[PDB]
What we know:
This is part of a larger assembly, with chains A, B, C and D.
Chain A: H1 21-34, H2 40-49
Chain C: E1 2-9, H1 19-26, E2 32-35, E3 54-57, E4 72-75, E5 84-88, H2 94-104, H3 118-126, E6 129-131, E7 137-139, E8 161-163, H4 166-176, H5 182-185, H6 187-194, E9 207-208, E10 213-215, E11 219-222, H7 229-238
Antiparallel strand pairs in C: 1-5, 1-11, 2-3, 4-5, 6-7, 9-10, 10-11
Helix pairs in contact in C: 3-7
Chain D: H1 13-20, H2 25-38, H3 47-55, H4 60-68, H5 76-89, E1 96-100, E2 102-103, E3 107-108, H6 115-126, E4 132-138, E5 144-153, E6 158-159, E7 163-168, E8 173-177, H7 182-194, H8 214-221, H9 253-256, H10 275-289, E9 308-313, E10 316-323, H11 329-338, H12 349-352, E11 361-363
Parallel strand pairs in D: 9-11
Antiparallel strand pairs in D: 1-8, 2-3, 4-5, 5-6, 5-7, 7-8, 9-10
Helix pairs in contact in D: 6-7, 10-11
Family (chain A): Belongs to the CENP-P/CTF19 family.
Subcellular location (chain A): Nucleus; Chromosome, Centromere, Kinetochore
Protein name (chain A): Inner kinetochore subunit CTF19
Amino acid sequence: CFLPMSKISIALWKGGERFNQIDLDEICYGLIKEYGVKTGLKEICNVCLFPDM
Amino acid sequence: INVSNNELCYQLKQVLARKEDLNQQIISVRNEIQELKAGKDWHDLQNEQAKLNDKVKLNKRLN
Amino acid sequence: PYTWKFLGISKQLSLENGIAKLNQLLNLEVDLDIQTIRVPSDPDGGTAADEYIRYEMRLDISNLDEGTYSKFIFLGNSKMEVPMFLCYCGTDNRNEVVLQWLKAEYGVIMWPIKFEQKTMIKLADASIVHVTKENIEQITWFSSKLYFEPETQDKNLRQFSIEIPRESCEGLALGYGNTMHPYNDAIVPYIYNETGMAVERLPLTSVILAGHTKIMRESIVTSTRSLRNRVLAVVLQSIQF
Amino acid sequence: LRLEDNYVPTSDTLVVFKQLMKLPVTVLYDLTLSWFAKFGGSIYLLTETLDLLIEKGVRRNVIVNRILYVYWGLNVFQLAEIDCHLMISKPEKFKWLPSKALRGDGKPYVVKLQPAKFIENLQTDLAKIYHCHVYMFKHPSLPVLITRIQLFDSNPLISRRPYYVAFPLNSPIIFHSVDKDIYARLVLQSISRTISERETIIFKPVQKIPVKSIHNIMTLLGPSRFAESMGPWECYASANFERSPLHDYKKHQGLTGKKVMVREFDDSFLNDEEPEIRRLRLEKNMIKFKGSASRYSSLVPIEKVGFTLKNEINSRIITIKLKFNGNDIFGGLHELCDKNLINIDKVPGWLAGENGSFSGTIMNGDFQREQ
């Protein structure tokens, strides 16, 4: 291809250290695949909040 | 030899008729196989099974 | 299967006289009823140039065969330019001997009638207007199958047909409005509006209805023996000058 | 029991004489050279004999007696070559019938086949049922692959009608010769099974009415720019109206302007000299029934077309059923319009010639084909 392709990846931190990258990559890939871009990121920050569920 | 030749001619005609019938049956069975293995319902259930497996994997890892 | 050939008649004549000469030349007996019929018996005609005198010269013979059975339906009017004509069916020799007698006795001029396109349109309009005994015109419908047969270079387009089903015909008739002429006010403007093919100028060959009639350019094939009054009225109106 | 090329069938000699008399002399020379190089019978010593024969200007009868009486049928491969060269020579005799290649959900699958490994696979699939022989060559002008599939029976071997399957190079539409016997379904089903090799392909037929030549079916439904436009949109399939952006602007249709005629929109046709206006009227008919500018026949001759117009007035579905016939339908329609019998202001697009050789209905102003 020759169009400028974009890349989206996320990373977490529990204060102590970074989390594993394979499960976070699979989770963000599946969440973007299932919801979208403008909706998937809201869901991933809502699940990284995790105050209730 | 003459009467058995007439008998074998009649039986060979019956055998050729059964051979044509088995040819038609083979063609019908293989056509049903090729229509069932590439049908829309098979691909639809395949995609739905793949989506259910991906959803249960995502739900397990998110939990 | 009664193919009605059509011939013309030059001079107005009565038929009550001279029929005994046909009986003497034929050694048979024929009945010639005098029906003073009149088209659209509804009172919007003025009772002027609307009546005709019909002479159904039947041949009351043994009806074991239909090809030898031949009627002779006539028509006349004492107001138009060409007053009379006839139409005959069958394949008998009696048709030839009676046209011989008609040429010999009264001294008239006979010629076959060729059809136009608008004449065929008016015949398809008139062959479905059914007359009932309650002095009104109820209109049946038929899944008509039009036909064309043009001649082009290298026989490009040989023949092509326009077929309209019955419910579609009734829908076009009820959507146009209440009129006694569907096939010249509704369908032909609809075909011109949706296709651009003006069927008045295209070469017609066989306006065929749904097994009921078969209008051609040289004859009319029907299923029953009798022919309606408006059909012969339109035919007699067509051959005027 | 898959028959090889060295087997000879039992056919009448005079019909092969009649077939081989329909070919020129140089293709007969090429056929003799190739057959003697591959099989022979009765090196370069016998080649100069025909080289001297064709130099003297002999007729075709003495050389066809030469080829039929130095080999005395020849074999199955020689008959396949004769019949395929006869197909190349006169293409107006055959009759093709197209069929699409679907798979999976319904997305079309390009065939992308190779001529080497496909032939032995098709033969080893067909040999488990009947006696068979296949033969596959490339058309010299058009980029297609014509495969001649021949079958036999045992009352030695009575031949069948040869069945042709034409593969285009990069299209999901596969043409086969028009037949409906059980051997035709067997050959088409066997090809549908052996062309796949990774995931299964089915052959839903896209048309029911046959079409005549291979150039016509290639221009209609093969890989081509004319594959969908085909009618009044024939200008977009050749791009004769615009130039590249790197061209001159002085010779541009925006700057030069095209001579046009004012259309009429009132009903001024049913009430019926100036040769410039006559030339512009003929140019208008040429625009509507064809591209920009013999002389009546279209690009492709279409045999049979049956339309259906299902309009809707005051919630009543009013159907009509147009049917056509003849050699070239839309050319004769352009001729009938040229004699001022059809008002070209009210000729719709589907009648004009677009989606050619497709007999389908119309439901509210947009064409769709029939199965």
